[PDB]
Amino acid sequence: ALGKLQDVVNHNAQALNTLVKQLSSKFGAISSVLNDIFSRLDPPEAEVQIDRLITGRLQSLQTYVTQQLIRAAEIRASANLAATKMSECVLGQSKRVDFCGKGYHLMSFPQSAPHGVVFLHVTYVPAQEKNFTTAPAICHDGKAHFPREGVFVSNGTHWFVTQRNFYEPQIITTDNTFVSGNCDVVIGIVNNTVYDP
Amino acid sequence: TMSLGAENSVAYSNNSIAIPTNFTISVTTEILPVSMTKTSVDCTMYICGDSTECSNLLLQYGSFCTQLKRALTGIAVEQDKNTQEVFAQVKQIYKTPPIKYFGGFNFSQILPDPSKPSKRSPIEDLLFNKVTDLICAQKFKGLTVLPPLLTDEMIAQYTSALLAGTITSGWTFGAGPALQIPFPMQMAYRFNGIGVTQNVLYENQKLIANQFNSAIGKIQDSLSSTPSALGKLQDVVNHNAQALNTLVKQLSSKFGAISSVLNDIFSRLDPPEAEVQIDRLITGRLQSLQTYVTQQLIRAAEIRASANLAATKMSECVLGQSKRVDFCGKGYHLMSFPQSAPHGVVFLHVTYVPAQEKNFTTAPAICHDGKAHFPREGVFVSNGTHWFVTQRNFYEPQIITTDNTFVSGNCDVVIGIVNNTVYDP
Amino acid sequence: AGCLIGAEYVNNSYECDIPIGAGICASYQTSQSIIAYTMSLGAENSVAYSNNSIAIPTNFTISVTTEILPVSMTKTSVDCTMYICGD
Amino acid sequence: GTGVLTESNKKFLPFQQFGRDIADTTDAVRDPQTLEILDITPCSFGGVSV
Numbered sequence A: 001a002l003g004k005l006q007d008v009v010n011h012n013a014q015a016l017n018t019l020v021k022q023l024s025s026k027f028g029a030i031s032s033v034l035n036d037i038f039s040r041l042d043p044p045e046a047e048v049q050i051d052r053l054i055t056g057r058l059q060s061l062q063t064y065v066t067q068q069l070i071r072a073a074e075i076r077a078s079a080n081l082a083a084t085k086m087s088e089c090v091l092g093q094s095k096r097v098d099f100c101g102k103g104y105h106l107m108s109f110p111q112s113a114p115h116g117v118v119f120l121h122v123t124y125v126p127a128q129e130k131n132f133t134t135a136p137a138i139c140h141d142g143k144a145h146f147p148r149e150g151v152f153v154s155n156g157t158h159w160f161v162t163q164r165n166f167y168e169p170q171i172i173t174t175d176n177t178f179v180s181g182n183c184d185v186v187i188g189i190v191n192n193t194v195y196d197p
Numbered sequence B: 001t002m003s004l005g006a007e008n009s010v011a012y013s014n015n016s017i018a019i020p021t022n023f024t025i026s027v028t029t030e031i032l033p034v035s036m037t038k039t040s041v042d043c044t045m046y047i048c049g050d051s052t053e054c055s056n057l058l059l060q061y062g063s064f065c066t067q068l069k070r071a072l073t074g075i076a077v078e079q080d081k082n083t084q085e086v087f088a089q090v091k092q093i094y095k096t097p098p099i100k101y102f103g104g105f106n107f108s109q110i111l112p113d114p115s116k117p118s119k120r121s122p123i124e125d126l127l128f129n130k131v132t133d134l135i136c137a138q139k140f141k142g143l144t145v146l147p148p149l150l151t152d153e154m155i156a157q158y159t160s161a162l163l164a165g166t167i168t169s170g171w172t173f174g175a176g177p178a179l180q181i182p183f184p185m186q187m188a189y190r191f192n193g194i195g196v197t198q199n200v201l202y203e204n205q206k207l208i209a210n211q212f213n214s215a216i217g218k219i220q221d222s223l224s225s226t227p228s229a230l231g232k233l234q235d236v237v238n239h240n241a242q243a244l245n246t247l248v249k250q251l252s253s254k255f256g257a258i259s260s261v262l263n264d265i266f267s268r269l270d271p272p273e274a275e276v277q278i279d280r281l282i283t284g285r286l287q288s289l290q291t292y293v294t295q296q297l298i299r300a301a302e303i304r305a306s307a308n309l310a311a312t313k314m315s316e317c318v319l320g321q322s323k324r325v326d327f328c329g330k331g332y333h334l335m336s337f338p339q340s341a342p343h344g345v346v347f348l349h350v351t352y353v354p355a356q357e358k359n360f361t362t363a364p365a366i367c368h369d370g371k372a373h374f375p376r377e378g379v380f381v382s383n384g385t386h387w388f389v390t391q392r393n394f395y396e397p398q399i400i401t402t403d404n405t406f407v408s409g410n411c412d413v414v415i416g417i418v419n420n421t422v423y424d425p
Numbered sequence C: 001a002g003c004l005i006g007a008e009y010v011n012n013s014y015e016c017d018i019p020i021g022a023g024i025c026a027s028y029q030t031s032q033s034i035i036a037y038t039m040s041l042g043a044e045n046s047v048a049y050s051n052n053s054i055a056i057p058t059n060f061t062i063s064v065t066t067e068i069l070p071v072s073m074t075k076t077s078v079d080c081t082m083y084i085c086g087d
Numbered sequence D: 001g002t003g004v005l006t007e008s009n010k011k012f013l014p015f016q017q018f019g020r021d022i023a024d025t026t027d028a029v030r031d032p033q034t035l036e037i038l039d040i041t042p043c044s045f046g047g048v049s050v
């Protein structure tokens, strides 16, 4: 589960172990011990043997620095992503899909972790769906009635108005729909009586 | 001197407003790289092939081969994860029903065609036919190309499942269970998501269907007319091709030695002084391969950033309706359709754009009986003599009633208050 | 991808456990043996689309997920003299 | 060196004795005894994943 945090520690440990093991190589020389070369060779020509090790170790350290920069780039990218999520998922309610959890984002809770942050996304997921007969609009007195905020559903014989995320049947009344035009252009409009309080 | 575009001077007045009277749906295209070319180099064969003495002399140069192999394996795993973070976002493969009547919209150009063997859409065929001895010489030197995990057919099936889920359900198959819904109602919801009411969608369904079909038909020829259209995917292929070509050509350098062939040195020169001639070549080729690896690291980082952007767009533009301006298309974002492409994804963004605007006289509020009336949802416009209330994205003049406006305070503090009589049913 | 020796190519497609390549993945399944198979993208679903049918959810579920995000690394400083010129 | 020898369809010239490539490695040769252009291709190699 905590694999996105252990991989960074493993990569750092492997980089350090490689930088340490790069000291036991000859880089084309006869040995990897400086005092051994200084005690077995003469100073005039020991330079052409020690400069190879010097250049090899300097290049290994430079490669380590370049790899650390490349890794810090994506680490900074992930940190910026985590900051944006902390600002959008914790400090508020974001409508972005698949950004603050899979589903309808409700809230988020932050937690600390070794070199990381864990977001617990409290999300809203619909379930136990049911099939109904829908219609684009209805007209009672020859004028079409379109749902103001909701959808017209049917239970086989009667028509009701429900919201787009929960089954709450309500009687079709005046303050639940708006009138715009007649029922001669909408394709699929069904006749139904509207209520007026 | 390059021009910064046209020059327009919109008239700004404290009483004039511009209300659009029609609209057009535009299908824009956006190309995004997702994956790269997984490359594996053979250390021994690249540094010194067909040579047994160099195979023993290379062991005394540190374990750089293990580092390069680990870096390449990490790059390959990252490129394989990029293809699953973008396309493999759904865990339920959906299927398009046999009846393909979705209210009047023709999705034949984006749905897979069972006639051809490959289950790709007519647009995917053009996308794959426009992204293009040299792959065998690099093979004989250590450079091999690893095949991706998800083949092209699996990515095509993922795109088809996402398309079927977007068409049949909309945005419900990304949050939870796939809730069935007619496509005209889905378009009405998309219109309500940007401010336009459902009557504009239900009264102009045929015109909107015709405009969508025309835009989809024009996209197919626009992608084929421009040759550099699919350049954001051919550039990565050209970059990896030239990076392999220069890596192969670096073996033609002596790096200060007497020759570039090791068999030419071991045969003439004896092992005593052949070391000073073989170590230079070994160091030069190892440094060239290390430079290749440290450049492919940055290239894979850029490809991973592009793949993360593409995954976020797939989650926000396809699995839902994002209100972010200039993120899912230039304008009022309505919907998006994903398509596969060689090492990339093509998003077709269907976007609402107003047109045929008209100038009217506006006012912050109106006063009937000494009390101000502010629009509940809309704006007050005028035709010269009468006053009406209409939405902010489509000219639909309606009589001003007590349901379209709300009373708040007296009409002596608002700067721009006009006198007008409201209706009460 | 190449030649695989040690696994039997089965025809029933399962979920990818050990990715091999080209859609082929390996797994350890039933005795016991290593099998290779084409990975399955998921279960087939057919939404009952209709010009008058809709699906309305009748209940809901609050789900707490978990998302991990790295923040920083271990700050490492290297000394040239002690690393290169060891004593 | 080491490699596989196969009869190549490369149309050499009477004075041409060898053949180079992008990396100036000898790809084809001419047998000094019998005039016949060969094709030196490297030995079969690959990667082993467990």
Ligand SMILES: *[C@@H]1O[C@H](CO)[C@@H](O)[C@H](O)[C@H]1NC(C)=O
Binding pocket: A129, A130, A131, C048
């Ligand atoms: C709706 O119909 C589909 C297809 O028959 C079915 O799979 C689904 O369970 C139905 N939903 C309910 C419970 O009404």
Ligand SMILES: *[C@@H]1O[C@H](CO)[C@@H](O)[C@H](O)[C@H]1NC(C)=O
Binding pocket: A155, A156, A157, A158
């Ligand atoms: C539809 O709902 C109405 C009001 O609750 C009820 O009287 C009627 O019997 C229902 N019909 C069916 C078939 O469910």
Ligand SMILES: *[C@@H]1O[C@H](CO)[C@@H](O)[C@H](O)[C@H]1NC(C)=O
Binding pocket: A189, A190, A191
């Ligand atoms: C709706 O009502 C009108 C007038 O009562 C009638 O002509 C028409 O056939 C009805 N249509 C439906 C959908 O029953």
Ligand SMILES: *[C@@H]1O[C@H](CO)[C@@H](O)[C@H](O)[C@H]1NC(C)=O
Binding pocket: B021, B022, B023
């Ligand atoms: C809206 O634009 C379409 C396409 O240009 C046109 O056919 C239609 O007549 C226009 N409608 C209006 C309001 O003029």
Ligand SMILES: *[C@@H]1O[C@H](CO)[C@@H](O)[C@H](O)[C@H]1NC(C)=O
Binding pocket: B100, B105, B106, B107, B108
């Ligand atoms: C969809 O478009 C194609 C190409 O224009 C056409 O051949 C086909 O008949 C159209 N299908 C529908 C649903 O009209």
Ligand SMILES: *[C@@H]1O[C@H](CO)[C@@H](O)[C@H](O)[C@H]1NC(C)=O
Binding pocket: B011, B357, B358, B359
């Ligand atoms: C509104 O007036 C401005 C200034 O005269 C003009 O440029 C603009 O085209 C007008 N818009 C329309 C079409 O009513």
Ligand SMILES: *[C@@H]1O[C@H](CO)[C@@H](O)[C@H](O)[C@H]1NC(C)=O
Binding pocket: B383, B384, B385, B386
């Ligand atoms: C303004 O609108 C009213 C009602 O539609 C109409 O009677 C009148 O002629 C219009 N006047 C102008 C100047 O457009």
Ligand SMILES: *[C@@H]1O[C@H](CO)[C@@H](O)[C@H](O)[C@H]1NC(C)=O
Binding pocket: B417, B418, B419
């Ligand atoms: C609006 O009407 C009142 C009288 O009802 C008058 O005193 C006031 O000057 C009028 N204001 C405007 C905008 O003409």
Ligand SMILES: *[C@@H]1O[C@H](CO)[C@@H](O)[C@H](O)[C@H]1NC(C)=O
Binding pocket: C010, C011
């Ligand atoms: C698996 O499918 C292939 C191709 O259809 C067939 O040749 C082979 O006999 C099948 N094997 C099994 C286990 O049925």
Ligand SMILES: *[C@@H]1O[C@H](CO)[C@@H](O)[C@H](O)[C@H]1NC(C)=O
Binding pocket: B099, B101, C049, C050, C051
């Ligand atoms: C509505 O959908 C059914 C398939 O469910 C199809 O047979 C019928 O022709 C469609 N009706 C229209 C309006 O074309």
Ligand SMILES: *[C@@H]1O[C@H](CO)[C@@H](O)[C@H](O)[C@H]1NC(C)=O
Binding pocket: A128, C058, C059, C060
């Ligand atoms: C909603 O789901 C919960 C948990 O399964 C259950 O206890 C409850 O009875 C359900 N309510 C409805 C409306 O079925």
Ligand SMILES: *[C@@H]1O[C@H](CO)[C@@H](O)[C@H](O)[C@H]1NC(C)=O
Binding pocket: D032, D033, D034
């Ligand atoms: C080489 O010499 C042998 C013995 O004389 C002869 O049989 C062979 O044909 C010669 N090959 C050529 C063509 O040089």
